[PDB]
Every structure is written in structure tokens, then in C-alpha cells.
Amino acid sequence: GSSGSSGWTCNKFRCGEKRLTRSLCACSDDCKDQGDCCINYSSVCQGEKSSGPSSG
Numbered sequence: 001g002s003s004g005s006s007g008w009t010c011n012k013f014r015c016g017e018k019r020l021t022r023s024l025c026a027c028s029d030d031c032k033d034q035g036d037c038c039i040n041y042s043s044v045c046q047g048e049k050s051s052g053p054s055s056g
């Protein structure tokens with residue numbers, strides 16, 4: 001099927017990934033060093049997860 005539409009966003013799971021072929025941004029740690037972290041990389045990845053059931 002088609003490759004897909006523009007995705008300038010990252011997903012909780014995506015965070016800390018090591019597999020990307022068709023993605024405008026990168027949801028991996030490397031992005032931090034390199035400089036290709038999605039616009040909302042920290043918002044999704046660097047969210048609020050600590051001693052909590054769900055980061056609702």
C-alpha cells in the first residue's frame with residue numbers, strides 16, 4: 001500500500017526505538033545527540049512517568 005502521510009509526531013512506544021525507514025522525524029535516543037527529535041518528542045517521550053499507574 002501507500003507509504004503514508006506526514007507524521008511529524010512520535011508515540012510513547014516509538015520512544016527508544018532502533019528501526020526507522022519511512023518517518024520524517026526520529027523517535028530514538030540518537031535523535032537527541034544528532035538533532036532529529038520529533039517536535040513533540042519530549043512531550044511524548046519526556047512525559048510524566050514515575051511511580052504512577054497511568055500518565056493520563
